[PDB]
Design a binder for this molecule. Structure first.
Ligand SMILES: [Zn+2]
Lengths: 10, 267
């Protein structure tokens, strides 16, 4: 399973 | 990364299997609101706040107001010069026995309206519903999607919750069901569709040129797709208004609205 997830590190 | 259009065009002339990955940047050029930037709100919330199983569990009326708004707004939006260049390139190359696939993070169907046929919508669609009882997925372009939502969904701060009881939110029309519908949109914290992921993995493994277009808003796993291709030595060209956290892994970076750079690149 692969989830949708917000990118935060930037 | 290089900004040599001439070098990119050399690869483009020979590539047999091109993957184009699109993000919200391409929709914003047609004036589609995204609800993600610093500053980008519907009422007091952003997309990451409403596009969640938590928001739907606790306030399904509000989440429906938000997707209702977004569906109705699309009424008057058109694909832009970047959507068109992508669709025309697909058509033209397919006559040469060359394959172009669009993997899109967008849920607004503007690529489909422009004529893209090989389209992987990895986060679903504004114009699909899924029944939370029977699981059936259906196309739905109705305006309004149900009568209790007529006139609702306004974006302005101050706007009161419609507080529509669940019985008068959109309901499944399959004979014998009656369950509560949800948008068939992938929310934060949920699984992407396993069948679509298999397609995506297969296309990315075969492709010999990858384009990454308007993906400044970072979301996983999509933000990993183009790095995965580049890590195999395959050229990746990024077309974006700014640099991203993955830009330094790609072969090309072309700065500017996609509408200005793509028509030339994909001619
Ligand atoms: Zn149902």
């Amino acid at each position: 399973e692969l989830n949708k997830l917000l990118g935060r590190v930037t | 990364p290089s900004s040599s259009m001439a070098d990119f065009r050399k690869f483009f002339a020979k590539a047999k299997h091109i993957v184009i990955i699109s993000g919200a940047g391409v929709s914003a050029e047609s004036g589609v609101p995204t609800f993600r930037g610093a500053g980008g709100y519907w009422r007091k919330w952003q997309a990451q706040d409403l596009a969640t199983p938590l928001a739907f569990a606790h306030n399904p009326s509000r989440v429906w107001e938000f997707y209702h708004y977004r569906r109705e707004v699309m009424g008057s939006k058109e694909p832009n010069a970047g959507h068109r260049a992508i669709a025309e390139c697909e058509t033209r190359l397919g006559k040469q026995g060359r394959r172009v696939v669009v993997i899109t993070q967008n849920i607004d169907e503007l690529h489909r309206k422009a004529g893209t046929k090989n389209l992987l919508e990895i986060h679903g669609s504004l114009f699909k519903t899924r029944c939370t009882s029977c699981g059936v997925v259906a196309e739905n372009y109705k305006s309004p999607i149900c009568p209790a939502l007529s006139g609702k969904g306004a974006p302005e701060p101050g706007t009161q919750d419609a507080s529509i009881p669940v019985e008068k939110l959109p309901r499944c029309e399959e004979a014998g069901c009656g369950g509560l519908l949800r948008p068939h949109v992938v929310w934060f914290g949920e699984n992407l569709d396993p069948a679509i992921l298999e397609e995506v993995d297969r296309e990315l493994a075969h492709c010999d040129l990858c384009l990454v277009v308007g993906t400044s808003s970072v979301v996983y796993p999509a933000a990993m797709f183009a790095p995965q291709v580049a890590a195999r030595g395959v050229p990746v060209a990024e077309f974006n208004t700014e640099t991203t956290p993955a830009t330094n892994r790609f072969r090309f970076h072309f700065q500017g609205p996609c509408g200005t750079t793509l028509p030339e690149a994909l001619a």
